[PDB]
Amino acid sequence: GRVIRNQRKGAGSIFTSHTRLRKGAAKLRTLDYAERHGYIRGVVKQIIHDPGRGAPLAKVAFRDPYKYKLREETFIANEGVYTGQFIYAGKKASLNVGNILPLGACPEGTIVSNVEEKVGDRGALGRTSGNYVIIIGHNPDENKTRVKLPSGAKKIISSDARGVIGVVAGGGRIDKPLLKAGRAFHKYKVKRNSWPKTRGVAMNPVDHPHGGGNHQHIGKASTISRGAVSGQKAGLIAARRTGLLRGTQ
Amino acid sequence: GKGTPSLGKRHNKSHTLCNRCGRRSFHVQKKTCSSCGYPAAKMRSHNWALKAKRRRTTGTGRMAYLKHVTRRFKNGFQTGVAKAQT
Amino acid sequence: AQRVTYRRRNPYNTRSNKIKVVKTPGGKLVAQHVKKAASRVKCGDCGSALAGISTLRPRQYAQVSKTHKTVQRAYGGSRCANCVKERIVRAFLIEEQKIVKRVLKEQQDKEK
Amino acid sequence: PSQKSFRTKQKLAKAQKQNRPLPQWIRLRTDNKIRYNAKRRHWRRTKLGI
RNA sequence: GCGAGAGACCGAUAGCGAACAAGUACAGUGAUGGAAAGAUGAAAAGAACUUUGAAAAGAGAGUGAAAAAGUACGUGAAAUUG
RNA sequence: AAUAGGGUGAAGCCAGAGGAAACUCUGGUGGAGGCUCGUAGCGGUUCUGACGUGCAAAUCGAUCGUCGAAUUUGGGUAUAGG
RNA sequence: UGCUGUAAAGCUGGGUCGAACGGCCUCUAGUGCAGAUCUUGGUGGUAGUAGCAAAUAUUCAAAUGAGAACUUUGAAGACUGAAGUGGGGAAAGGUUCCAUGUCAACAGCAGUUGGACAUGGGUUAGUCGAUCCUAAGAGAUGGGGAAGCUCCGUUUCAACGUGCUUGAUUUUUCAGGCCAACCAUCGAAAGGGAAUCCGGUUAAAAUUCCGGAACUUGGAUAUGGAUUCUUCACGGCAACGUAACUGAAUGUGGAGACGUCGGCGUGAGCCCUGGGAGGAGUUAUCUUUUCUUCUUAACAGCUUAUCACCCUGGAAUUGGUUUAUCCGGAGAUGGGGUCUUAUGGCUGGAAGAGCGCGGUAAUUUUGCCGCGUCCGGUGCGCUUACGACGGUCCUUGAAAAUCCACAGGAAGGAAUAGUUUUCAUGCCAAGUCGUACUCAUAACCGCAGCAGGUCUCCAAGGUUAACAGCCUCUAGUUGAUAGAAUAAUGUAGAUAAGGGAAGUCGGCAAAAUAGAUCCGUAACUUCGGGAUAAGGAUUGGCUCUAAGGAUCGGUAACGAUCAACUUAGAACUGGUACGGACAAGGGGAAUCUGACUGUCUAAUUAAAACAUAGCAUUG
RNA sequence: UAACGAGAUUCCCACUGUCCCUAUCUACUAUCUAGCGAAACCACAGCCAAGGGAACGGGCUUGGCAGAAUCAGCGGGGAAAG
RNA sequence: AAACUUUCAACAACGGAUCUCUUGGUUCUCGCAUCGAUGAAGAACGCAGCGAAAUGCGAUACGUAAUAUGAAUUGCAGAUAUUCGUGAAUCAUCGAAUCUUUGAACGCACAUUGCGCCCUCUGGUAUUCCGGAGGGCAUGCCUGUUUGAGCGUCGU
Ligand SMILES: CN[C@@H]1[C@@H](O)[C@@H](O[C@@H]2[C@@H](O)[C@H](O[C@H]3O[C@H]([C@@H](C)O)[C@@H](O)[C@H](O)[C@H]3N)[C@@H](N)C[C@H]2N)OC[C@]1(C)O
Numbered sequence A: 001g002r003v004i005r006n007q008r009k010g011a012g013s014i015f016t017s018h019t020r021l022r023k024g025a026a027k028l029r030t031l032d033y034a035e036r037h038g039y040i041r042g043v044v045k046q047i048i049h050d051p052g053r054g055a056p057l058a059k060v061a062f063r064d065p066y067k068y069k070l071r072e073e074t075f076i077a078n079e080g081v082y083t084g085q086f087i088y089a090g091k092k093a094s095l096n097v098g099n100i101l102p103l104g105a106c107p108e109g110t111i112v113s114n115v116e117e118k119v120g121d122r123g124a125l126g127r128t129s130g131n132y133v134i135i136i137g138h139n140p141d142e143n144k145t146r147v148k149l150p151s152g153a154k155k156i157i158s159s160d161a162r163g164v165i166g167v168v169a170g171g172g173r174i175d176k177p178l179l180k181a182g183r184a185f186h187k188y189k190v191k192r193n194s195w196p197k198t199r200g201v202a203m204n205p206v207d208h209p210h211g212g213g214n215h216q217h218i219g220k221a222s223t224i225s226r227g228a229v230s231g232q233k234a235g236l237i238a239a240r241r242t243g244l245l246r247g248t249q
Numbered sequence B: 001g002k003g004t005p006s007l008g009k010r011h012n013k014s015h016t017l018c019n020r021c022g023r024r025s026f027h028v029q030k031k032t033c034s035s036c037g038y039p040a041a042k043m044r045s046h047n048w049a050l051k052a053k054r055r056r057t058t059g060t061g062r063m064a065y066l067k068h069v070t071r072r073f074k075n076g077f078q079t080g081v082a083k084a085q086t
Numbered sequence C: 001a002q003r004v005t006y007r008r009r010n011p012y013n014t015r016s017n018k019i020k021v022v023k024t025p026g027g028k029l030v031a032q033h034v035k036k037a038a039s040r041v042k043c044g045d046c047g048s049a050l051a052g053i054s055t056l057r058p059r060q061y062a063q064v065s066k067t068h069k070t071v072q073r074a075y076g077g078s079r080c081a082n083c084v085k086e087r088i089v090r091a092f093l094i095e096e097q098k099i100v101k102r103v104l105k106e107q108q109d110k111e112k
Numbered sequence D: 001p002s003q004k005s006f007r008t009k010q011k012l013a014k015a016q017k018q019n020r021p022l023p024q025w026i027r028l029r030t031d032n033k034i035r036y037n038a039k040r041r042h043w044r045r046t047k048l049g050i
Numbered sequence E: 001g002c003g004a005g006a007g008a009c010c011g012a013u014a015g016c017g018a019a020c021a022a023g024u025a026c027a028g029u030g031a032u033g034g035a036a037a038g039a040u041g042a043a044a045a046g047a048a049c050u051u052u053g054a055a056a057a058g059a060g061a062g063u064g065a066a067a068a069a070g071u072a073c074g075u076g077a078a079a080u081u082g
Numbered sequence F: 001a002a003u004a005g006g007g008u009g010a011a012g013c014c015a016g017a018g019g020a021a022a023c024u025c026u027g028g029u030g031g032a033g034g035c036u037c038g039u040a041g042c043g044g045u046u047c048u049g050a051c052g053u054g055c056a057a058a059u060c061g062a063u064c065g066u067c068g069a070a071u072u073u074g075g076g077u078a079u080a081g082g
Numbered sequence G: 001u002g003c004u005g006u007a008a009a010g011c012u013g014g015g016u017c018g019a020a021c022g023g024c025c026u027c028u029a030g031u032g033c034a035g036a037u038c039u040u041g042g043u044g045g046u047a048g049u050a051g052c053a054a055a056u057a058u059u060c061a062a063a064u065g066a067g068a069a070c071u072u073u074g075a076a077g078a079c080u081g082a083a084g085u086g087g088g089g090a091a092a093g094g095u096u097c098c099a100u101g102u103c104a105a106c107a108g109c110a111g112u113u114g115g116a117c118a119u120g121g122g123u124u125a126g127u128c129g130a131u132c133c134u135a136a137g138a139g140a141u142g143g144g145g146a147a148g149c150u151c152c153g154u155u156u157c158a159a160c161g162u163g164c165u166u167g168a169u170u171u172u173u174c175a176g177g178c179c180a181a182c183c184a185u186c187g188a189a190a191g192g193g194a195a196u197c198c199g200g201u202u203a204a205a206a207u208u209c210c211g212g213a214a215c216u217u218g219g220a221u222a223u224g225g226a227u228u229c230u231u232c233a234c235g236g237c238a239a240c241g242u243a244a245c246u247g248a249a250u251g252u253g254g255a256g257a258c259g260u261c262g263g264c265g266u267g268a269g270c271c272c273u274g275g276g277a278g279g280a281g282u283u284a285u286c287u288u289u290u291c292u293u294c295u296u297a298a299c300a301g302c303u304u305a306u307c308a309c310c311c312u313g314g315a316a317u318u319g320g321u322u323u324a325u326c327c328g329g330a331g332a333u334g335g336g337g338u339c340u341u342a343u344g345g346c347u348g349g350a351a352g353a354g355c356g357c358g359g360u361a362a363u364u365u366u367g368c369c370g371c372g373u374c375c376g377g378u379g380c381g382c383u384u385a386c387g388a389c390g391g392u393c394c395u396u397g398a399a400a401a402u403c404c405a406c407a408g409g410a411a412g413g414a415a416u417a418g419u420u421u422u423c424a425u426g427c428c429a430a431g432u433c434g435u436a437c438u439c440a441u442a443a444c445c446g447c448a449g450c451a452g453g454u455c456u457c458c459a460a461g462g463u464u465a466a467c468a469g470c471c472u473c474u475a476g477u478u479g480a481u482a483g484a485a486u487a488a489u490g491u492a493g494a495u496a497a498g499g500g501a502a503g504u505c506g507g508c509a510a511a512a513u514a515g516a517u518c519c520g521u522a523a524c525u526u527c528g529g530g531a532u533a534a535g536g537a538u539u540g541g542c543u544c545u546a547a548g549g550a551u552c553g554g555u556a557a558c559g560a561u562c563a564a565c566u567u568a569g570a571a572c573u574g575g576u577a578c579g580g581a582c583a584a585g586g587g588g589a590a591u592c593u594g595a596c597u598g599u600c601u602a603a604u605u606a607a608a609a610c611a612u613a614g615c616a617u618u619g
Numbered sequence H: 001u002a003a004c005g006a007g008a009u010u011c012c013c014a015c016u017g018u019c020c021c022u023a024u025c026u027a028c029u030a031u032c033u034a035g036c037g038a039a040a041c042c043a044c045a046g047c048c049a050a051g052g053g054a055a056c057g058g059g060c061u062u063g064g065c066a067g068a069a070u071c072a073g074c075g076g077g078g079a080a081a082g
Numbered sequence I: 001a002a003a004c005u006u007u008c009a010a011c012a013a014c015g016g017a018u019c020u021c022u023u024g025g026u027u028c029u030c031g032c033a034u035c036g037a038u039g040a041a042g043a044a045c046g047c048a049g050c051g052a053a054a055u056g057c058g059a060u061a062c063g064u065a066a067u068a069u070g071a072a073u074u075g076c077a078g079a080u081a082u083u084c085g086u087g088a089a090u091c092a093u094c095g096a097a098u099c100u101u102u103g104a105a106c107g108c109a110c111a112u113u114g115c116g117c118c119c120u121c122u123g124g125u126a127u128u129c130c131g132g133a134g135g136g137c138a139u140g141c142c143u144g145u146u147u148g149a150g151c152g153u154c155g156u
């Protein structure tokens, strides 16, 4: 047979991300002295669109603590953040929408976004439009905080990890139907080469494990072992179950 | 349309002249000569292509220096000048 | 009607290959090549165009004297009049308010 | 094309120089074998391959 | 590679691809592919001159041992043709 | 970098009319859309037309699909034989 | 010419020819051809045969020449018809360009002609490009893999400056200080980017030469001006103005720098048009006539603007206002100012140029002279540039070089002295490579001078919705073997009594319909459609009538002057014609099937196949 | 299942040379000429009937018969060519 | 009976077999050890009185010097070229030189005849701007020199 499309994606030739029009990576500030011990004030300069991203970005300017120079940061904008607003980041920062605080400083029930998995990684969790992370509980003796993620998973993070108070802006994109192949075309035009998708059962046996036959059909179970090898993992990879979901989960 | 019509769209050179060997085998985008392997330090050659070795090898050029080594060896690699006779 | 040709080797209608049709004293109709339009100098705070500043292609700003490139005021060729006024009042009122916070703090410190 | 490199134009100059008929005084030399220039080239038939 | 001497070898469709301005001419985007083609006569003595023709050429003449050797040149088979 | 000329007439806006109210009706304006008739362009349905030792190793004539976008296209650049 | 042998073969007469060769005894082998769709070369029949038929079309005379259907000149008839058979370029070619000679081969007839052949000539730049910048990307370097060719990394686990500024000192040595986040390099003749125009000139070059007139960058440097004893200028309430009018490190901002569509406004070029002054044409008759010339560059100065802004003032009887509905106590309307100079006006450039006429010098190189070159109008016109607006996206539509400005306040500065070349004038210099020509029914690729293929700019009159079709002007071609005839069968195109799909697998092919105005329009429906459903009527020419505007001037409801093509109606009129050529839907009732727009088997399949939005599942 | 379709199908109206049943006209060929000038194919070749025969002969056997050189057409045969 | 066709013969064609040769090939043997950063092999472009190749050569360009030798070269032309001679011709010999642009290819780059920097001299009134001549600036590694870094570390 032939190398399937699955496998071709990893060589990264025509499947690399289209990044010319992107507006810089969205990260928190580096943990510095000011954020460890106090707070630093910055001002929102711009709220801009990032192609390929559903959420708008905020350009926020900060003074450099150690030399006469202005530092610009690219943040993920939460809803309600406006141009000209002052942003406070640090341990002593107040509990206001857009402020960056350690998770230990936020009370139970706080909604927060762009949350760090590890202390100082500048943000990993709850970054897409409309999503957020909920603070569930604190374990001060272990210096651990328990959070709830957009997928529903519960996780334990260091209380020194940071997050940005509020909900990521741009929420509700998916409530409106795309309606058109052309809208999908323009969507992925600035993301990557993943669209349109040819169905495996519409190919020949060289192309796919689903190819061939005198009718279009899969022919064996579409649930594939986690221990299968590349070229075999097409279908439902290591599925615990299949079929329509009914009842609670 | 893959024959005569398609043959009408040939006006972008894949190869240009190679500085080292001069053949028009210097691939423009790869910046490599398909004939001599320029700009690699070694000359391209293969034992499965003996006739390619014949075309470009020692003795196909001028041999401006090796030409005269055997005469210089024959005289013991002399230094100095010749002497007029009595 | 007389028809014209590009005076340069570029045969394509690009941003840098625009032409104007002019009539010469020889009675001819010729194409004349047009430089790209200049953009206004803009305020560094609000983005509006600045009054009193010449509109030139950026290399040409090194040829004119300083009076065509600035305005006689603080931040003259950089920020517009309203944003300069707004910077002055904000600087005054905040630094006055800082003294009100300093003096009041001492009273809060003194009263207890 | 009109726009051309120095290297190309130098090759074109040499190509013109070699496209000439035999000097007829050559044929008069003692034991001459060349009757004509066998390495002529016409621009429309055989291409230079530069 | 450099210098030599040889052969119950081949003799121009043979012998190296190449006896010759042969790795040439030429082909291919490229890697590569790659021919054909030796011999007038001892000597050019390579036909002065006249004539017909627009000319190429012809007819005389001339050189040569030979033009039944005329740079379509040693001999000059067969197919095929007058 | 390129893409005649028409048809239809979406939101928004103006005016008038009706109604107790909730609301509704009429005339304009406006100029939306992988909308439509149809050039250039791009494509290639049918004649199973021509041609079929061709003009051509895929062409020619008519007929035809589409024609403001998932549109057409130059140049640059990347992906290389299981 | 014969002889010998059953034969494989051997010998001999005659001719041709020119340098070596044979018998016998033995040795040895790359040793014997009719075939292998054998190999290479050569040659027939076919056969003077197939054929040399797309792209409207040629003709008379003269010249030249041995020779003319094919060359040149004149006359004419035509065509392309500005979406060109016109004028240029990019890619590619490479001398094909030009002049002179020239016809063996080539131009599938011919050839005196040629992109052929031969000999020469020809490509001139500070301002046009390349060169430089970065784009996707490519790729060296401390390094980490790999037996290795080499692979990987480029914000790369690295002691990574061939740093810079002054105070000067000459001693070519110093003294300091300031920083080093980033930065090898390559990557665009369409992206970014310092600066040139007009007239003339060659056989062949020109934004490159000549003449005139400028501009840019780099440098030097003098005069004039400006500034300072209130040291680093004044004026304006302000927006801001100006000939100038210190400003280190460092920091910040602007430009470079950006999709697409819609109508509206303005400019320019073109189109149209009145008067006048020249020239041509027509003149049976007429036409204040039909045609043609009347032009103005870069650059310099002054002036010129929508938008934006400032001052005043304080708004409901809400007003201002666009084709498009936004704006105003966060200050409208009103009044007065400021600014960008896109674009236009006047002047210089510049009439000296160019153009149109008229007269001459004369076999003459080349001129020489005079006169005119002027004043208006018009617009849903065409193209293009700019402007102010409006819409649109789960799409929001490059980077870098490079230049300027600000913030900052280091340092240095006047009293009879330093600036400052961001004010004026003057001085010097600008290297390298490309530059001819074709760009295509003959200069490129398709084996070729092949009906194929191959990116782009300019774009006149009439008809019209129209850049379609049809006719025409400028320009360009008149090329494609030709002559004589006009059987059959073809190919391409037409018409046909009566019938009207009986033909055929099948209405295949053809026909029929068709523009515009007015009327009228069903089921069904996702309420958007269906729909040009279906189905009717009208349409020429001429002579009239009515409506729809602009600018000035105080019940102005008015006068005066000007002006564009749309719409509606009536009379008359003809072989009842009239979207008169051109251009230009056939329609209806249903079934199967895919929702739709979209996509693929280059060269036998375009579909019901693929995609798609929507839906679900999985990690 | 509205809308859409160069998709497959049935009927109707209109329309017609598809047909009854053919005729006529034009251009370019074909044709004849001057010039120019290929290719496929080719064991040898080329009139029939029957026989026998590798069971369908141009040739063989027995008969019919049989007169140069040819031109335009033609598609029975050459179990024609590819 | 001609024409036509067929067969033979002669002569003439077409074509290049045959025969004769051979500065070539092919095999065997004998002898020798010598490429390159002191820039090779290879590439490009040039160079002659009249040359396109081949052959030779490098702006000193079908060659310069030197040694030997002793009258040519030659297709034509021509010495301010030569003959009992420092003398014609000569890749005869060869020990001195020249050796464009490149190439392992070395300042950087190279689809560019693109772009720096250092030293000496020199032109334009010039340490800086513009021009000319000559000489320099690659990488890995070795030995050494010099200037340095590290509370790695000794002593005072
Ligand atoms: C001028 N034309 C030349 C011509 O020189 C030709 O030469 C042949 C020549 O080779 C022949 O001569 C021949 O002689 C013998 C024998 C067969 O004759 C051959 O073996 C040999 O190869 C050859 N030299 C000679 N007989 C005729 C020329 N035209 O060589 C080629 C050519 C282009 O046709």
Ligand SMILES: CN[C@@H]1[C@@H](O)[C@@H](O[C@@H]2[C@@H](O)[C@H](O[C@H]3O[C@H]([C@@H](C)O)[C@@H](O)[C@H](O)[C@H]3N)[C@@H](N)C[C@H]2N)OC[C@]1(C)O
Pocket: F081, F082
């Ligand atoms: C299923 N096994 C196949 C096996 O059949 C074989 O595949 C060959 C393939 O290698 C050949 O291909 C080979 O040769 C071609 C060419 C020179 O012909 C090259 O292009 C190719 O690189 C070379 N691998 C291909 N021509 C036929 C397959 N069956 O080679 C191994 C294999 C790929 O696993």
Ligand SMILES: CN[C@@H]1[C@@H](O)[C@@H](O[C@@H]2[C@@H](O)[C@H](O[C@H]3O[C@H]([C@@H](C)O)[C@@H](O)[C@H](O)[C@H]3N)[C@@H](N)C[C@H]2N)OC[C@]1(C)O
Pocket: G157
């Ligand atoms: C135990 N030895 C480790 C040695 O493995 C190494 O650690 C590297 C560390 O330097 C790298 O990290 C480093 O390099 C990455 C680079 C690769 O992108 C940088 O982004 C990062 O800033 C830099 N600190 C880390 N990403 C992996 C560790 N094994 O260097 C540190 C060390 C302690 O010597």
Ligand SMILES: O[C@H](c1cc(C(F)(F)F)nc2c(C(F)(F)F)cccc12)[C@@H]1CCCCN1
Pocket: A095, A107, A108, A109, A110, A111, A112, A165, A166
């Ligand atoms: O835990 C709750 C909570 C909710 C939310 C909300 F859902 F709105 F985002 N935000 C909370 C926040 C907040 F993130 F800062 F807004 C802090 C503390 C508790 C919050 C309750 C809300 C009522 C007051 C007590 N905490």
Ligand SMILES: [Zn+2]
Pocket: B018, B019, B020, B021, B022, B023, B025, B026, B033, B034, B035, B036, B037, B038
């Ligand atoms: Zn090479």
Ligand SMILES: [Zn+2]
Pocket: C043, C044, C045, C046, C047, C048, C079, C080, C081, C082, C083
């Ligand atoms: Zn502002």
